[PDB]
Amino acid sequence: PVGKRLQQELMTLMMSGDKGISAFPESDNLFKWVGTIHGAAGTVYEDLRYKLSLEFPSGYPYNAPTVKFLTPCYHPNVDTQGNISLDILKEKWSALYDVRTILLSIQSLLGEPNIDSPLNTHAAELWKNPTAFKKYLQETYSKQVT
């Protein structure tokens, strides 16, 4: 029933047509997916894109999947390993959330960080100055495509 649910979740994702979100399982393993997120329009992450891995452990859906950024991401709530501090992925994970909900939540986090409990203190600090933030973000992102 778990593999079935994941297939149904992929179909839901495909027919929803949400902008800037995309993900599929690897051909040999339905329990490991790779996804892509684009920053939401109007945010400093607009026009930038990031790849993420999604792994569904044996305890899923009771236990949350492990989600990490594969593309380096400079952001208050992401660390050097691509780990993400997002409540719904940890303490507030619910077995009723689908892949679409997770992707949308992470896309939303890009534009609205939790700067009170950061993983990247420097980014949390610079966030107060958007122009300055945008600049460092683009600079750092830029060094991720050459």
From Swiss-Prot:
Q: Which UniProt keywords apply?
A: Acetylation, ATP-binding, Cell cycle, Cell division, Mitosis, Nucleotide-binding, Phosphoprotein, Transferase, Ubl conjugation, Ubl conjugation pathway
According to its UniProt record, this protein's enzyme class is: transferase
Q: In which pathway does this enzyme or protein participate?
A: Protein modification; protein ubiquitination
Q: Which reaction does it catalyse?
A: S-ubiquitinyl-[E1 ubiquitin-activating enzyme]-L-cysteine + [E2 ubiquitin-conjugating enzyme]-L-cysteine = [E1 ubiquitin-activating enzyme]-L-cysteine + S-ubiquitinyl-[E2 ubiquitin-conjugating enzyme]-L-cysteine; S-ubiquitinyl-[E1 ubiquitin-activating enzyme]-L-cysteine + [acceptor protein]-L-lysine = [E1 ubiquitin-activating enzyme]-L-cysteine + N(6)-monoubiquitinyl-[acceptor protein]-L-lysine
Q: Name one GO cellular component term.
A: nucleus
| GO BP field | anaphase-promoting complex-dependent catabolic process; cell division; exit from mitosis; free ubiquitin chain polymerization; positive regulation of exit from mitosis; positive regulation of mitotic metaphase/anaphase transition; positive regulation of ubiquitin protein ligase activity; proteasome-mediated ubiquitin-dependent protein catabolic process
Record's comment on post-translational modification:
Autoubiquitinated by the APC/C complex, leading to its degradation by the proteasome. Its degradation plays a central role in APC/C regulation, allowing cyclin-A accumulation before S phase entry. APC/C substrates inhibit the autoubiquitination of UBE2C/UBCH10 but not its E2 function, hence APC/C remaining active until its substrates have been destroyed.
For molecular function, the Gene Ontology terms on record are: ATP binding; ubiquitin conjugating enzyme activity; ubiquitin protein ligase activity; ubiquitin-like protein ligase binding; ubiquitin-protein transferase activity
Write the Enzyme Commission number(s) for this entry. Answer: 2.3.2.23, 2.3.2.24
Q: Where is the active site?
A: 85 (glycyl thioester intermediate)
Q: Which residues form the UBC core domain?
A: 1-146
Task: Write down the superkingdom of origin.
Answer: Eukaryota
Family membership, please give it: Belongs to the ubiquitin-conjugating enzyme family.
Task: Tell me the subunit arrangement.
Answer: Component of the APC/C complex, composed of at least 14 distinct subunits that assemble into a complex of at least 19 chains with a combined molecular mass of around 1.2 MDa. Within this complex, directly interacts with ANAPC2.
Name the job this protein performs.
Accepts ubiquitin from the E1 complex and catalyzes its covalent attachment to other proteins. In vitro catalyzes 'Lys-11'- and 'Lys-48'-linked polyubiquitination. Acts as an essential factor of the anaphase promoting complex/cyclosome (APC/C), a cell cycle-regulated ubiquitin ligase that controls progression through mitosis. Acts by initiating 'Lys-11'-linked polyubiquitin chains on APC/C substrates, leading to the degradation of APC/C substrates by the proteasome and promoting mitotic exit.
Name assigned to this protein: Ubiquitin-conjugating enzyme E2 C
Q: Give the source species.
A: Homo sapiens
Q: Which gene encodes it?
A: UBE2C
